[PDB]
Amino acid sequence: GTTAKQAEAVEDSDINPWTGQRHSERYFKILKARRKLPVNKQRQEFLDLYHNNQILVFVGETGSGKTTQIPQYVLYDELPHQTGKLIACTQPRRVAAMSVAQRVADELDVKLGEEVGYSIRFENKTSSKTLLKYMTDGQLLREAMHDRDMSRYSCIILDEAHERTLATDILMALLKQLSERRKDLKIIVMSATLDAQKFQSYFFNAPLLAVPGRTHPVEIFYTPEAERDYVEAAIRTVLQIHACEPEGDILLFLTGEEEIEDACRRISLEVDEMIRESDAGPMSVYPLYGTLPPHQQQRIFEKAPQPFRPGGRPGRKCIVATNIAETGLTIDGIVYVVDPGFSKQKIYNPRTRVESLLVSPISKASAQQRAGRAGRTRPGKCFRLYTEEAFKKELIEQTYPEILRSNLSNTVLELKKLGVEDLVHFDLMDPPAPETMMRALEELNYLACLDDDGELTPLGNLASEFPLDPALAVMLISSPEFYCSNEILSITSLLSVPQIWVRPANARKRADEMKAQFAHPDGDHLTLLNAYHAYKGAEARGEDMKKWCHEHFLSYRHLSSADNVRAQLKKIMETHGIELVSTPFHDKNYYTNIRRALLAGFFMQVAMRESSNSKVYKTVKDEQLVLIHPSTTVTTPYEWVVYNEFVLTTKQYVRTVTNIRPEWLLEIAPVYYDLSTFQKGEIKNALTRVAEKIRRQQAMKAS
Ligand SMILES: Nc1ncnc2c1ncn2[C@@H]1O[C@H](COP(=O)(O)OP(=O)(O)O)[C@@H](O)[C@H]1O
Ligand code: BEF
Ligand SMILES: [Cl-]
Ligand SMILES: [Mg+2]
C-alpha cells in the first residue's frame, strides 16, 4: 500500500531511484510543473482505483497528464512487486509513441532506451534496463502473436482508444479475454473524447475516473459562412494569423501528402510576398505525413525563427500535417490550430475488395482532439473552418471503427494467428454482422486458407503475409504453377487498387481511343496488364508520367500505387522461397496461362451464359442473373467467364470480365466444383456435360 505522498517523496529525492545517479536540475524544473497538472490532484484516487480493480477507465481533458503521468504513477507502484515485467502504453501513431517516450524519459531523468523506451514496427529502442515502454497498438499486437498471454507486461495501458483502430479494437477484445485468464495483469483504457459508459460496460462494468479541468484554455472560433475550397480557406487563415496575431506557431491539418506539399509551397510563396510588402515576420513551413522520412519528421520540433528586427512582428512556424498529429503529440510553441475538418479515412469496397483512402468529414471527437493540440503549454485558440451549426448537427460524434471499414477476411486470418478459435462469438466492442463474419469464413474456407475444422492452413498463413485481399494472395501464390507469376504479380497489384480508367464526361471519345490501345479481346485483366506495361514502358524512356497518364486517360495515383504494391509483393515471395517465372510472349499458351491463373483466386466469381439467344449470364455464387458490363474489351464473350466485380445499378452487371474454359474450373478448384455434392441446377448440368465430354474425348484417343 504505497501512497502518492510516499512516491512524491521519492520523486523529490536527490538520487534517482532507478539509476542511482543524482537528479538533474532539469528534472526538478519539470517535476514542479508536472504537479500542477489536473491528474496530480487525483493521484491517490487513481491508486485507490488501481489497487482494487483489474480494469480501469480514465478520462480527462486534452493535456491533463494522462499519457505522461499515469504510467509513471503505475511505475512507482509496480516495481516493489519484483515481477520483472514491464508497463506498456500504446499510441496509435509512430511519431506519438517516439515523442512521448523521449518526454517521459526526460520526466524520469533517464536516457531514452534505458528505463523508458519505445517499440515500433522497425525499431525497438529498448534494452534490458527498460521498465516503461511506449509502443504502438500494432507493435503490441505483433508481440501478442508470439506471446498470447503477454507474459512480459504487468500493466497494459491502451492510450487513445477513441480512434478505434484495427489494432486497438482487437487488443481490447484480446485483453478482455486475458483478464479472466490472467489476474496479475492490470488494464487501463484512457482517452479524452471517449464513450466512457460504453467502455465501462464492455470491460465487465469497469470503474470510471473522471478528471476535470484544463491546464490552459482553448478558444474555439467558427466561420460564419461555408467555404468549399478548404485548402484556400486554410491558406487564407494561416496568412491572417501571421499578419494580425501575436507570437505563436500554427498547426494546420490537411488530408494527404500531395495536398500539403502544394499547400506548403503556396504558403511560403505568399508569405514571401507578405514580407516584402506588409513588413511581417518570417514563417517557417514544415510538412508532416506518414510517408515522410523520420529525420525530416523530427524537424517539426525545430525552433521558430526570430524576427527580422528587434521589436518587429514575431517569427512563426507553420506545421501543415495530416491526422498523424491529431492525437498524442504535444508540440511546444503551438498556439493556433486551423481545422478544415477533413481527413483521409479508410473505406472498403465490398464488390472489388479494395481498401482505399477517401477524404471525408472528421468527427466531433477528432475536432476536439485537433483543438487539444493547443492549450497544453500555454493558452491557445483553434480556428475551425466550418459552421458551429455544422459542428453540432452535421458532424458525427465518434469516428467509425476501422474494423467495420476494413477487409474482414484479412482480419480473420490475423485473428487466427493471434489464437482466436471462435470468430462469430469474438467479443468485439462493435463487431461486424454475423452474416458478414460467416461470409468471410465461408470464402476463406473455399480458398483453402482455413480448413473444414476452421483452423489456419499454411496457405492461409502465407496469404496473411501479403497486404492483399486473400483471394488475390492465393492467386499470387498459385501463380508459378501456371507459369505466369511475373504477370499475375502485376495483375494482383492493379486489382488491389481502384480502377485506373479515367473517362471524363467532356472527353469520352478521346478516353476510349487511348484505352483501345491497350484493349485485349479475351479479358479485361489483360487490358489492365497491357496498360501497366505501357506505364512502365514510358517510365523507362524518361517521360513525365503525370503528363503521360493524363494524356492516356489513366489514373496516375492508382497506377503508381500498384507499382509500389507490386514491389512489395515481389519481395514477399522472394523471402519465402517462391518461384518467379513467366512464359515467353510468343508461346502458344501465354495468354491462356494468365486466364487460367485468375481462377486460382476467382473461381467463385464465375458466370455462365443461359442461352445462345440471351446475353444474360448466371453467376455461380447465389445464382444471380447478370449482364456483361459495357466497359468490356471482350468483343465476344465465351459461354463461361470469370469476373472481378459485381455491379449493382439499374441493371445487374459483372465488371472486369475474362473469357475462360469451363474445364478449367474442375481442374483448378475441384473442391468447390465437386460435382458429387454440388447444387442441383443448370450450371451443374452444364458442368457435368463438360466433364463427360472430356471423358469421351480422352478415352477414344486412348483407343
Ligand atoms: N514535449 C513536451 N514539452 C513540454 N511540455 C510537455 C511535453 N509533453 C507533455 N507536456 C506537458 O504535459 C502535459 C500532459 O501531456 P499528456 O500527458 O500527453 O496529455 P494528455 O493527458 O492529454 O494525453 C501537456 O499538456 C504539457 O503541459
Ligand atoms: F488527450 Be491528450 F491530448 F492526449
Ligand atoms: Cl482510418
Ligand atoms: Mg495523450
Residue numbers in the entry: 60 to 762
Report text from the authors:
DEAH-box adenosine triphosphatases (ATPases) play a crucial role in the spliceosome-mediated excision of pre-mRNA introns. The catalytic activation, the catalysis itself as well as the final disassembly steps are driven by so-called DEAH-box helicases. They all belong to the helicase superfamily 2 (SF2) and share at least eight conserved sequence motifs (motifs I, Ia, Ib, II, III, IV, V and VI) spread over two RecA-like domains that together form the helicase core. Two RecA-like domains, referred to as RecA1 and RecA2, build up the helicase core. The RecA2 domain contains an anti-parallel β-hairpin present in all DExH-box helicases, which protrudes out of the RecA2 domain thereby contacting the C-terminal domains. These domains are divided in three distinct domains, namely the winged-helix (WH), the helix-bundle (HB) and the oligonucleotide-binding (OB) domain.
A structural analysis revealed that a serine in motif V is involved in polar interactions with one of the ligands in all structurally characterized catalytic states. Since mainly the mainchain of the motif V serine interacts via water-mediated hydrogen bonds with the adenosine nucleotides, we tested if a higher flexibility of the mainchain at this position has an effect on catalysis. We could furthermore structurally characterize Prp22-S837A in the adenosine nucleotide-free but RNA-bound state, as well as Prp43-S387A and Prp43-S387G in the ATP-bound state. Since Prp22 could not be crystallized in the presence of an ATP-analog, an existing crystallization condition for ADP-BeF3−-bound Prp43 was used to structurally characterize motif V serine mutants of a DEAH-box ATPase in this state. The structures of these three mutants show that motif V is able to adopt the same nucleotide-specific conformations regardless of the side chain property. In the ADP/ATP-bound structures, the mainchain of this residue interacts via hydrogen-bonds with conserved water molecules constituting the active site. The interactions in the ATP-bound state force the serine mainchain to adopt an unfavored conformation, enabling the mainchain nitrogen to hydrogen bond with the catalytic water. Instead, the mainchain is sufficient for sensing the adenosine nucleotide state at the active site and this sensing function is sensitive to the flexibility of the mainchain. While the ATP binding is improved at maximum flexibility (glycine), the sensing function is completely abolished at minimum flexibility (proline). The lack of a side chain at this residue position in motif V of other SF2 members is in agreement with the findings that it is dispensable for the function.
